[PDB]
Amino acid sequence: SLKIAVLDDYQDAVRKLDCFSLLQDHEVKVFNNTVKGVGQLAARVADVEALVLIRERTRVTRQLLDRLPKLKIISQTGRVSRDAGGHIDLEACTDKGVVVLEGKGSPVAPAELTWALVMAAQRRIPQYVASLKHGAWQQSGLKSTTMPPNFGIGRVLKGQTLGIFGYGKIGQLVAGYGRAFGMNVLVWGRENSKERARADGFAVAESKDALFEQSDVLSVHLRLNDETRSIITVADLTRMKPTALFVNTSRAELVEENGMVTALNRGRPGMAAIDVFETEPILQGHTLLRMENCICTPHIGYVERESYEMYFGIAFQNILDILQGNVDSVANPTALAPALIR
């Protein structure tokens, strides 16, 4: 019987999941807000032996682990990144003999979310809905002199060009949606992405430059690492059409710092839809939130009922499996060794 904490559950959804009953033999506290800074966070989880993390919402540093003597298990919803950086210091965990348990993820919820944003942006749904609530009939704004003529009006997807930057599992689903809407789908990425795209019957853009020039909607599906940090520059974005939509439900740092705000202010692309920010949560506003030609959602790509059932079901079962000596989900198995060999 462990003291378990689940962090960063803003809408208090975790405790209402069918899978929550998996932890019936344990004492579970779910927190509904985020605390940053080592001191306050260590005091909040001082007695917990098992910590459940929601994706990358909280980072686990050596300095945090120094302040947590009772911690035995970190159970990660979704994948644990082995690369430099990563939101969990695995070596520091291994040093304390804290096991990190790895879950599994799914591309479906964030792919559908990507498309929901494509459709919402191209039809100016948030803008029209908000205007209507304030009494303005059929008004979406977007009528500035710097903007294209009739930019406030909806745009059809059929027969337009969809650029897909990155062809992993999410990119592949979203490319499929494009095809089913009758869009002209072009893919770009590393060599193996191009190969899998060609095998799937998708056209590959001539170059990265060609992707940004030609796309009416450009959507980014890349994992963040040293190769892809700042891979999208202001030069790339300002190559985009004045009527073009830039979509990013991946990671904010894929675009060079302030690059997006900068490009929107220069009028190319014409619109953006984003789900991810450099700093989260955003409680005190953001430049992009005050722009009528940006639609921003609060990192809801994976916030979905079936996704939570699967994600937490696995993270909770992982804790149960470890307590029975099944250590298959351990990311850092050398933390199981005695302190003498550690």
- Kindly state whether residue 305 participates in binding a copy of itself, applying the rule CB under 8 A: yes
What is the CA 204 to chain-centroid distance, rounded? 25
d(CA 37, CA 322): 29
**248 contacts 272 by C-beta, under 8 angstroms:** yes
What is the CA 31 to chain-centroid distance, rounded? 20
- Kindly state whether residue 19 participates in binding a copy of itself, applying the rule CB under 8 A: no
Give the binding-site size for a copy of itself (rule: CB under 8 A).
66
3-state SS, residue 218: strand
d(CA 313, CA 22): 8
Identified binder of Cl ion from the candidate list 5, 49, 53, 55, rule CB under 5 A: 55
Q: What is the largest CA-CA distance in the chain?
A: 72
Q: Which does 102 bind (CB under 5 to 8 A by kind): Cl ion, a copy of itself, none?
A: none
* Binding to a copy of itself in span 222-281, by CB under 8 A: 280-281
Q: Which does 55 bind (CB under 5 to 8 A by kind): Cl ion, a copy of itself, none?
A: Cl ion
- Kindly state whether residue 300 participates in binding a copy of itself, applying the rule CB under 8 A: yes
Neighbour count for residue 193 (Cβ, 10 Å): 21
* Binding to a copy of itself in span 112-151, by CB under 8 A: 112-113, 115-117, 119-120, 122-126, 128-135, 137-140, 143, 149-150
Active site residues: 251, 280, 299
Q: Which does 125 bind (CB under 5 to 8 A by kind): Cl ion, a copy of itself, none?
A: a copy of itself
Helix axes 125-133, 108-122, angle to 10 degrees: 60
* Nearest to Cl ion of 55, 96 (CB atom): 55
**299 contacts 275 by C-beta, under 8 angstroms:** yes
3-state SS, residue 295: strand
Q: Write out the residues near a copy of itself by the rule CB under 8 A.
A: 10-11, 13, 16-17, 108-109, 112-113, 115-117, 119-120, 122-126, 128-135, 137-140, 143, 149-150, 152-159, 176-177, 179-181, 280-285, 289, 295-300, 303-308
Q: Write out the residues near Cl ion by the rule CB under 5 A.
A: 55, 302
